[PDB]
């Protein structure tokens, strides 16, 4: 066993009844003085390194050609001047195993952390040396972390796409289904997770040109998509991951759910395609009143009204659907469907739950389209227009397929540096650059939506780490007050940066004029309610930083009205799974699953303590499963009120609790304004 492995395992060997957390630090030293420094490839100077990486097809030469070598040297020197040290063994291990650039045979390390950060910063700046240094300082301080696609692939010749998630709308036609399968394979080839809205597809037993009971429903398309994602599995490196979203009022909703039952037959079971359910407020109202609900056949509704079932408001059209004899429907028990959802989430963690009305009551771009589904991580909530892929030799009507670039603020590092504004603006600029340089030649709706919406996702990580390292319980009202203030600041500065980009470029996102940003409605709660901290401890935490007031929000509203906004969507809180290790941060705004996690790598086992875990903050690092899910819902709703897109909200459940407890948590989330629920992980 390696020396650093033994040093890391020495953490759990208690001394005087206490964990040896400091041993972890020793491990990193070993991991660098025995493995990383020996396995790294050193050159005489930076010029030889850059030339070797360029000619050997490791780096794209275009982004490096925008800078003179003196500027690149200055950027690299700025990166190395911080003398960044990984405080935990797992941070360095995760970076050098998942994100550091290696040779073709993967026998040596070509990229250090500073090298990777410098390359990403130079790609972000697009020829601006000062901007590149700003990005270097932002990432080496670990205030901002680009998503895994962006951080791993920026400036690389053998790179994939920098966009993490893609959302596709599938129209009710064989041509559209085949095009959706093709685009899903193309985007999984690019490495991104693909989500498909199957609510427009007509249910099982519908007519294909006057021959009835002919359609296979959404389950056949689900099987096709599952095989497509199995085939396109990132060249066999990462399993192809897809998501299917169906409205709960679709007739196939049961069969949909039956794809995830552990007793499902092979002709129905789907195993590589995640499932999500979109629940309008009408379904929750029907379940609450115990009135029997009706699921609908989408094609009959489309024939009668000319629009898809998910294209209009069910809260106002459900009674018209039910009373219409030309609309076909089936009777269901909404409470039984809710119990089935809870049982399925207990068994397998599926489906994702999207509260459609919670998303669309604060959605700023309802004029473009209502949000009808979410992404594979159930945090992207954007307007999408379905595409009409016609026959060959016929022009296709290209719609809008959602796609946003992810980037997370490290809350602990951002607040320690007292740089919410600067970090938010620089992250917005980096995400705007990632969107601008993204061009996908096989997904036309994705390309058009990227060019028009200009949507980005700016997330946050290390919420629980910051709260526990500052002596604040994650479930406490003080923690929710901190989240309210911090994310109001993040939203304020993201809107300010979006408006500044719109002013400097003279262009807004497409159809911005009909948005609530243009009409000023979006700023209502910000121009009437003060989001400054209500607790003295939180206010002290925010000292040295100008917390925006109602007057600052009014000025920002006027600025947006004058100049517009460059981005249709700005903030989305992704799960941030593996890149949180490198940043020494807790995953996303979720509470920690465990204080010390035991992970098996190779034939060895490693223990990763939570960042900053110690004796004095052991009980502030409360495990998520031990927490009240209602207070976690309260925290997520408090954050969500300042996030325009959704938050990947994983439910952390105990084995003792029943499906009724899961249903109660889901209904409280819906009541509190939670937009989406990601996972039901049971301990």
């Amino acid at each position: 066993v390696p020396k650093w492995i033994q040093l890391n395992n020495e953490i759990m060997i208690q001394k005087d009844g206490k964990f040896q957390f400091d041993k972890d630090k020793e491990a990193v030293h070993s991991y660098f003085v025995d493995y990383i420094n020996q396995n790294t490839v050193f050159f005489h100077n930076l010029k030889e390194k850059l030339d070797y990486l360029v000619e050997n097809q490791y780096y794209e030469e275009e982004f490096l050609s925008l800078y003179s070598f003196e500027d690149i040297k200055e950027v690299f020197k700025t990166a190395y001047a911080k003398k960044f040290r990984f405080p935990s063994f797992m941070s360095a291990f995760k970076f050098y195993n998942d994100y550091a650039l290696k040779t073709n045979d993967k026998k040596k390390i070509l990229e250090r952390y500073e090298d990777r950060i410098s390359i990403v910063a130079l790609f972000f700046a697009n020829g601006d040396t000062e901007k590149a240094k700003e990005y270097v300082n932002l990432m080496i301080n670990q205030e901002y972390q680009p998503s895994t696609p962006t951080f791993l692939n920026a400036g690389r010749k053998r790179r994939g796409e920098l966009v993490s998630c893609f959302l596709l709308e599938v129209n009710d036609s064989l041509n559209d289904i085949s095009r959706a399968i093709d685009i899903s394979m193309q985007l999984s080839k690019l490495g991104g997770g693909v989500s498909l809205n199957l609510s427009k597809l007509r249910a099982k037993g519908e007519a294909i040109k006057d021959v009835e009971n002919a359609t296979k429903g959404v389950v056949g398309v689900m099987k096709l998509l599952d095989n497509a994602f199995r085939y396109a599995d990132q060249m066999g490196q990462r399993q192809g991951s897809g998501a299917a979203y169906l409205n709960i009022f679709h007739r196939d909703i049961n069969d949909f759910l039956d794809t995830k039952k552990i007793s499902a037959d092979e002709d129905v079971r789907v195993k590589t395609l995640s499932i999500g359910v979109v629940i309008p407020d009408k379904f929750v109202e029907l379940a609450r009143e115990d009135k029997a609900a009706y699921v609908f056949y989408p094609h009959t509704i489309y024939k009668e009204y000319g629009q898809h079932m998910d294209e209009m408001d069910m809260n106002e059209m459900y009674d018209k659907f039910v009373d219409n004899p030309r609309v076909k429907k089936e009777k269901i028990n909404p409470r039984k469907l809710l119990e089935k959802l809870a049982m399925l989430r207990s068994e397998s963690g599926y489906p994702y739950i999207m509260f459609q009305d919670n998303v669309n009551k604060v959605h700023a771009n309802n004029h473009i389209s209502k949000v009808k589904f979410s992404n594979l991580c159930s945090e992207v909530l954007q307007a999408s227009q379905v595409s009409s892929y016609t026959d060959y030799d016929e022009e296709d009507e290209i719609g809008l397929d959602i796609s946003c670039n992810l980037g997370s603020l490290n809350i602990l590092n951002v607040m320690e540096h007292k740089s919410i504004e600067k970090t938010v603006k620089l992250a917005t600029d980096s995400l705007t650059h990632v969107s601008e340089t993204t061009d996908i030649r096989n997904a036309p709706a994705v390309r058009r939506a990227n060019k028009a919406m200009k949507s980005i996702g700016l997330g946050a990580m290390n919420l629980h780490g910051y709260l526990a390292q500052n002596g604040i319980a994650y479930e406490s009202p003080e923690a929710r007050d901190f989240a309210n203030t911090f994310f109001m600041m993040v939203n304020f500065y993201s809107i300010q940066r979006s408006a500044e980009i719109a002013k400097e470029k003279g262009e807004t996102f497409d159809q911005y004029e009909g948005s609530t940003y243009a009409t000023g409605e979006y700023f209502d709660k910000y121009v009437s309610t003060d989001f400054s901290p209500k607790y003295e401890k939180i206010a002290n935490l925010f000292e040295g930083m100008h917390i925006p007031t109602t007057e600052d929000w009014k000025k920002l509203k006027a600025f947006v009205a004058e100049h517009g906004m460059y981005h249709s969507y700005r903030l989305c809180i992704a799960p941030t799974g593996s890149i949180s290790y490198v940043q020494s941060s807790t995953a996303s705004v979720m509470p920690i699953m465990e204080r010390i996690e035991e992970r098996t790598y190779g034939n060895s086992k490693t223990y990763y303590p939570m960042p900053g875990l110690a004796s004095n903050n052991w009980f502030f690092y409360k495990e998520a499963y031990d927490m009240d899910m209602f207070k976690v819902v309260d925290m997520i709703a408090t954050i969500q009120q300042h996030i325009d897109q959704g938050i990947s909200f994983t439910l952390f459940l105990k084995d003792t609790m029943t499906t009724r407890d899961l249903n109660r948590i889901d209904l409280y989330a819906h009541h509190r304004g939670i937009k989406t629920i990601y996972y039901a992980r049971t301990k």
């Binding site: 609450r288 409470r335 809710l338 119990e339 207990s346 034939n603 029943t658 499906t659 209904l667 049971t682």
Partner: protein
């Protein structure tokens, strides 16, 4: 979670000895040296003798003590394959390659052989020690069974696979490959039944069962090394056979949900070429807060 799936895989792998014509092996058998013919005969008898124990005792005893109708059916099917298919197949190979008197002598020799007997009796001892309603003794026997199916057979399988990978004794090699494919799934299945018992135990009891499994593996492994030299030194193959034993020991451990014991090694390319939360109804007032 797994018995119906294994049922399917087992029954779809059904085969009979008569399907492979054996006589064409005599066209390569006649060209082997005395040491090659001797090793082959001895290996074959070793496999035959061990597989008979599995058919008469190993599978039926496990089927007897395991609860569950579907598991008993799968286990019965596996016992059938040992007694009705595998045993007849080994006999057929022997009758094709050697005259009656030679077969009787080889079995007399292998029956007296110290290394074959040591492992055969160690395994049988654990089957005989199973006690009614005692899941610990059942687990120990399952470990023994997995070690036979997924590990002990492979010092023997090596040689037919070695010939099969070279284009020699292709008919009997095809038969051996079908047998081996059955033993692989038998080992995986019994392994899952053992893990089920293991997972029902306390942490101290688990550590104790792990020590049992590793200790047993060590005893069998040290005897396999001696068995290997005894048979394969005369044909110069022992080094490569030892690598194959360790590789298969690791598979057996993985079948029991344990970590590999031996470092990863490459295998001879000729042999490679041959190879539910409680449902509680919503009570209303759960929609109001």
């Amino acid at each position: 979670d797994f018995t119906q799936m294994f049922y399917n895989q087992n029954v779809k792998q059904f085969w009979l000895p008569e399907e492979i014509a054996l006589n064409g092996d005599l066209l390569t058998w006649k060209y082997l040296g005395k040491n090659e013919q001797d090793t082959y005969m001895k290996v074959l008898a070793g496999l035959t003798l061990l597989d008979t124990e599995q058919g008469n005792t190993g599978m039926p005893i496990v089927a007897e003590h395991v609860d569950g109708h579907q598991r008993k059916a799968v286990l019965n099917f596996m016992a059938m394959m040992e007694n009705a298919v595998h045993a007849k197949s080994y006999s057929n190979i022997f009758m094709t390659l050697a005259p009656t008197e030679t077969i009787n002598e080889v079995f007399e020799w292998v029956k007296q052989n110290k290394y074959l007997q040591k492992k055969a009796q160690m395994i049988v001892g654990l089957y005989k020690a199973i006690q009614k309603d005692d899941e610990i003794s059942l687990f120990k026997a399952m470990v023994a069974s997995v070690y036979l199916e997924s590990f002990l057979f492979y010092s023997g399988f090596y040689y037919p696979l070695y010939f099969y990978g070279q284009g020699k004794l292709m008919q009997s090699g095809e038969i051996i490959n079908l047998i081996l494919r059955d033993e692989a799934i038998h080992g995986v299945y019994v392994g899952l039944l053992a893990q089920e018992i293991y997972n029902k135990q306390t942490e101290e009891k688990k550590a104790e069962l792990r020590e049992f499994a590793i200790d047993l593996l060590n005893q069998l492994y040290e005897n396999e090394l001696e068995y290997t030299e005894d048979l394969y030194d005369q044909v110069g193959l022992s080094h490569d056979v030892k690598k194959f034993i360790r590789y298969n020991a690791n598979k057996a451990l993985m079948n029991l949900g344990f970590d590999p014991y031996f470092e990863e090694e490459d295998i001879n390319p000729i042999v490679l070429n041959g190879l539910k939360a409680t449902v509680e109804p919503l009570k209303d007032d759960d929609f109001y807060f």
